[PDB]
Amino acid sequence: DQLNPESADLRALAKHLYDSYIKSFPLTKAKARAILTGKTTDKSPFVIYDMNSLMMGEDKIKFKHKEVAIRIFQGCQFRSVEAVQEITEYAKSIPGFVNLDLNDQVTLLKYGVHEIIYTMLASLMNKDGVLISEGQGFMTREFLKSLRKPFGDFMEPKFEFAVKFNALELDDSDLAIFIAVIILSGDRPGLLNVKPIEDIQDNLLQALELQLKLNHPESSQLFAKLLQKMTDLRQIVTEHVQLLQVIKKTETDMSLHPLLQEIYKDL
Ligand SMILES: CCO[C@@H](Cc1ccc(OCCn2c(C)ccc2-c2ccc(SC)cc2)cc1)C(=O)O
């Protein structure tokens, strides 16, 4: 750790990513945690904890998307497609990203967006449930587990991931760099020019390590633990696609949103 022009550049990169992240993502972790504790001055979210409150909340909240379990399943797909858009806008602000070959930009987003979705879902989760509709609702973990087979399973691994990930106590300034690192992964299948991606990622990794050393004086293991989480996330994505296939095997009339079908196609 020294104050030299390289470290000043790395702090400027971290600040740029934070400022962009705040612009691209409506509900930050900082705001989400204030809502979850009730410390916000905003109105409380509507809590969905059973079938009755699900129906009352659908009448209260403007959801942009059958029976209950299918409606929730579809609402998650619609949120996912929205999130793809937000993450794409964020990726355009990562220095160097839009100068990569446009096919590599697309490949990096295809293989990275779900890892980012699950990372940022953790910001909205506690032990009891998840904030939905940019904080207007809160849907409980046990209500999700109560949905009829084969729909009662798919959020559980995401809550399990979140409980452990949230224990690391990252803030938005940390997360903005972490999710840039994930997007700039040079080992995604089918990339045309790996070296320029790795060069960007190495710089982001340096910015992340410096940020974590400055921002978390009471951990020295945090960077290594975050590299571990990046591997965990790929397992969560794969397991989710497998879950979706199982659902399709028995609910053959289910269909994924066409954009998710393309992302999952060669995945
Ligand atoms: C099954 C598809 O899974 C997806 C991956 C996936 C899984 C869960 C998920 O939570 C989203 C929960 N949320 C948020 C954070 C805002 C609005 C909703 C919401 C509001 C209302 C409802 S229904 C009243 C549902 C959701 C987002 C993406 C994929 O494979 O791309």
Swiss-Prot record:
Domain of life: Eukaryota
Keyword set includes Cytoplasm: yes
Chief site of localization: nucleus
Biological process (GO), any one: positive regulation of low-density lipoprotein receptor activity
Compartments in which it is found: Nucleus; Cytoplasm
Regulation of protein activity: PDPK1 activates its transcriptional activity independently of its kinase activity.
Motif stretch (9aaTAD): 258-266
Binding site for rosiglitazone: 77-80, 114, 240, 264
Posttranslational mods: Phosphorylated in basal conditions and dephosphorylated when treated with the ligand. May be dephosphorylated by PPP5C. Ubiquitinated by E3 ubiquitin-protein ligase complex containing FBXO9; leading to proteasomal degradation. Ubiquitinated at Lys-23 by TRIM55 leading to proteasomal degradation. Ubiquitinated by E3 ubiquitin-protein ligase STUB1/CHIP; leading to proteasomal degradation.
GO molecular function list: alpha-actinin binding; arachidonate binding; chromatin binding; DNA binding; DNA binding domain binding; DNA-binding transcription activator activity, RNA polymerase II-specific; DNA-binding transcription factor activity; DNA-binding transcription factor activity, RNA polymerase II-specific
Domain NR LBD: 9-266
Keywords, comma-separated and alphabetical: Activator, Biological rhythms, Cytoplasm, Diabetes mellitus, Disease variant, DNA-binding, Glycoprotein, Isopeptide bond, Metal-binding, Nucleus, Obesity, Phosphoprotein, Receptor, Transcription, Transcription regulation, Ubl conjugation, Zinc, Zinc-finger
Induction summary: (Microbial infection) Expression increases when incubated with M.tuberculosis or its lipoprotein LpqH; induction is TLR2-dependent (at protein level).
Tissue specificity remark: Highest expression in adipose tissue. Lower in skeletal muscle, spleen, heart and liver. Also detectable in placenta, lung and ovary.
Entry GO CC: chromatin; cytosol; intracellular membrane-bounded organelle; nucleoplasm; nucleus; receptor complex; RNA polymerase II transcription regulator complex
UniProt cross-link Glycyl lysine isopeptide (Lys-Gly) (interchain with G-Cter in ubiquitin), position: 23
Segments of this protein annotated with the region Interaction with FAM120B: 1-51
Disease / disorder: Defects in PPARG can lead to type 2 insulin-resistant diabetes and hyptertension. PPARG mutations may be associated with colon cancer. Obesity: A condition characterized by an increase of body weight beyond the limitation of skeletal and physical requirements, as the result of excessive accumulation of body fat.
Subunit structure: Interacts with FOXO1 (acetylated form). Heterodimer with other nuclear receptors, such as RXRA. The heterodimer with the retinoic acid receptor RXRA is called adipocyte-specific transcription factor ARF6. Interacts with NCOA6 coactivator, leading to a strong increase in transcription of target genes. Interacts with coactivator PPARBP, leading to a mild increase in transcription of target genes. Interacts with NOCA7 in a ligand-inducible manner. Interacts with NCOA1 and NCOA2 LXXLL motifs. Interacts with ASXL1, ASXL2, DNTTIP2, FAM120B, MAP2K1/MEK1, NR0B2, PDPK1, PRDM16, PRMT2 and TGFB1I1.
Role description: Nuclear receptor that binds peroxisome proliferators such as hypolipidemic drugs and fatty acids. Once activated by a ligand, the nuclear receptor binds to DNA specific PPAR response elements (PPRE) and modulates the transcription of its target genes, such as acyl-CoA oxidase. It therefore controls the peroxisomal beta-oxidation pathway of fatty acids. Key regulator of adipocyte differentiation and glucose homeostasis. ARF6 acts as a key regulator of the tissue-specific adipocyte P2 (aP2) enhancer. (Microbial infection) Upon treatment with M.tuberculosis or its lipoprotein LpqH, phosphorylation of MAPK p38 and IL-6 production are modulated, probably via this protein.
Family, as annotated: Belongs to the nuclear hormone receptor family. NR1 subfamily.
Entry domain remark: The 9aaTAD motif is a transactivation domain present in a large number of yeast and animal transcription factors.
Protein name: Peroxisome proliferator-activated receptor gamma
Gene: PPARG
Full-protein positions shown: 230 to 504 of 505
